[model samples]
Target: SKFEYVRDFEADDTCLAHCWVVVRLDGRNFHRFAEKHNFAKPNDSRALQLMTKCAQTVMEELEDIVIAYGQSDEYSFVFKRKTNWFKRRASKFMTHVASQFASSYVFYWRDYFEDQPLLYPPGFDGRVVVYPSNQTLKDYLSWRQADCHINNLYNTVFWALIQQSGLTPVQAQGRLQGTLAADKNEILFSEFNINYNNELPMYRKGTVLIWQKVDEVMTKEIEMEGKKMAVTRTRTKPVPLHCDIIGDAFWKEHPEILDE
Candidate 1:
């Protein structure tokens, strides 16, 4: 059974080496999914938390996933630039991240959505991109955070008008027409008395996951002249953050992420 020309039929799938590899996963037609699940209008805290949980699992399960950012139903994971995980195979990185994230989403759904049952299986679509420089990678994350702010602002006003002001969707759309961030802020304040600035940081800033060194007890087997002992030590853990990644402050504080 050594005959295997089919194996040669596989195409070259290696990603470029020495570059930042990113695998972004996005919900496909999630509006319908949200409607079916009766997700809270504007944003669902439980659903978002579940997403972070899944992204965290993906980072822990995969090698070199330095950080991840999630907004709405989309999450992008950044791999360490020098990482040669899975031999830098593009499909391998993309599929592994997507599968691990999706599977973890289901596996841990109960923890977050205890009140609501998961009726149908959900899926995520993935795509891979490689950035050649640290600046470009930084800009990529900034772009998503920018988008997060834009959409969150829009949704905040859109929902507030409907739920608080009793405006229909069409009326809300008309109300938001030709509106900027400041204009929307005014609408939220003057009409509904909801200060857009005081909105949930998670909704406005999205989630950022990073590994942090922490002290913890560890077990180690040691033999001393025919004797053995279990030793405990401290370790580190990855954590989730809801903060501003758009500016230099975060990067400056976590300089290790860029390895500069």
Candidate 2:
């Protein structure tokens, strides 16, 4: 038993299980496209078209193990690996997929899936930590369904009708979040693992908690600027990268060069 325990078990929530690979498109590019094209909606059609083509290209190469390919800015599908050969082939397959899409921008994430313990059955997979049930995942879906479809509110009221269809609140929430339908309310709920529909039962009280706890952790990531023209001017000096504008923290640090 001692051999299996790690020294840092208490520091981290260890109840997560399952594995998934996620591929995300560059958000910065999408934003620029929206501004340039004057699209009134958050998810522009042209951007969706580009992402669909990328998904199509990736799926064609991974057709043998691929599940289903759908059309959204963020597209993903599970690999139905049934054997060691399938697993072995997947490793090479991803590498080839990456190479094939080298011209486009993409980021791949290998996430360890964690279900909340209360929701999962007893004596489940030990590796998967099932703690922190998904409440926010549910709420976002509620918001997405409401705004996107006509029967969203009615469907939310009757969601109990289909809770057993492998469609947990979290998964449903993901469908909405992945498509960029969620907002700050959804982000707050995500941290709490609170289902959107369940939270709606006590909406006023829940919104208070979401705002209080959500800002505690803010995550930020940096990547190359997505511009056809990457250029920036610092005083008398001009630096060019690709075809767009960018900030230069590096040049700012060595501002003494301007003294010469």
Candidate 3:
């Protein structure tokens, strides 16, 4: 019985009750890995697809995650404020997200990138943060979307400079130094004849994962007046969507996503 004392030394790290939990995951050393794997510049459709697939799997596997967002090699998952999974253990929540995401990425790598080979193991790091209210949660997601806009704008212009303008990497970097949003847009339009506004929405805005209610029709057999009849029933399913979630409009349309 004396050996039971060791259990007491284990520290408690449970999250407070009725608080929103957010787990953000990022790939380790993905810059070099992306270069080695020859990921397409600006935004690679295949890479983004794979990331979305993995994130969808995470939402399916974990019951608490209500929404997810992914950009580049990073993904963020949000759990409802009133979840009771593992009694809101912070480490458990973070570890499961990181492991599941990394594993899914490796497992489905062949499906997305048929020609690319996985030369080594891949991993991700996860961190957890809590939000006290719906507004705070929305603000957190808005911050990520803002970051996606900033980074994508910079990368889109940088690649255009190198690919179309015949500028060296050093020159492109120098040109973009201390530049603002308008400056980048002007450079794209004035010099390269490319309109930054016309770029693909997926590349510019990143990807958002939210639950959408989809209706399905089901037929059932029923006995009526000693004759077999078919009855139709409608069911609703939580479907995943890849769209914009940066504004209050999305939330206004899907008021059920956030609890009061």
Candidate 4:
């Protein structure tokens, strides 16, 4: 009873008010994990599908998370500025998202991969940042898109070099070294006849999750007096889309995300 003073060890953990709270989680040491799992090069559809599913699950299960954008091993969840969820505690928000996502990933693994299976538990590192203005928050997402395009472009070109060019992995890396974006695009174009512009948008833009109202049909059986009747119900949920968010086109389409 006299040891109550230890409770004061907890620090004041409230994040700033009236700002967008973002909890971004990135896989820790994913390269090793990928190699162990023998994931496909450049892009792995199965892993991406699972990641998007987990992110959607987190959004619906958590509070005020209106949108999420993810590429490769990282996902960022954005909370509306007006939310007072968990008193804006950074620790709670961060840990909640990381734990929820990890749990979802492991639990949903069977749906995606049936081969080697998850040999061991994986983990993610979460960080919390508050953006003061919609302009700044938009800029944050813009930065992530830039990274997605740049890194994916490099990987796509690298894969082409090794797969079609008959070059070893080390040789391919050496050949790709000191190459600019335009250089790599030209390399794929002139040498391999592969147009970088024609690549899948998901490879370049990753994926984003947003809440939209949609009608759904549900069947229910009404049992009365040894008779059965079917009833239908409609519901809504958030969905993941592989699209570009660098421009105002998407913002125009989804104006409800940015509150006034």
lDDT of 4 at 231: 47
Q: What tens-digit string does per-residue lDDT give for candidate 3 at 177-228?
A: 9999999988888887888768877777778887655455443333354444
Model 2: per-residue Cα lDDT over 10-122, one tens digit each? 44322223222322222334445444545433233344444444444555545432222222223333332222323433344445444444334232111111121122111
Model 1 steric clash pairs:
216-234, 218-233
Count clashing residue pairs per candidate: 2, 24, 0, 0
- Per-residue lDDT tens digits for candidate 1, residues 1-260, read 68886798899888788899999999878889899888998999999999999998888888888889999999999998888778889999989998998899889998888889888889899999999999999999999999999999999999998998898999999989999899998888888888877888999999999888876544343235544555553365568899999899999999999983
Instruction: Indicate the residue-level lDDT of 91 in model 2.
Output: 40
Instruction: After superposing candidate 2 on the true structure, give the runs of residues whose Cα lies further than 4 Å from its correct spot.
Output: 1-29, 37-42, 69-72, 83-95, 102-260
Q: Which candidate would rank higher by lDDT, 2 or 4?
A: 4
lDDT of 1: 0.89
Q: Give the distance in Å from residue 1's predicted Cα in candidate 1 to where it truly belongs.
A: 3.1
For each candidate in turn, the TM-score is 0.91, 0.28, 0.87, 0.90
RMSD of 1: 7.1
How do the residues 61-158 of candidate 4 rate in per-residue lDDT, one tens digit apiece? 88798889999999999998988889999998999999999999999998789775898999898999999999999999989999999999999988
Per-residue error for 90 in candidate 3, Å, reads 0.4
What is the Cα-based TM-score of model 1? Answer: 0.91
Cα lDDT computed for each candidate against the true fold: 0.89, 0.32, 0.83, 0.88
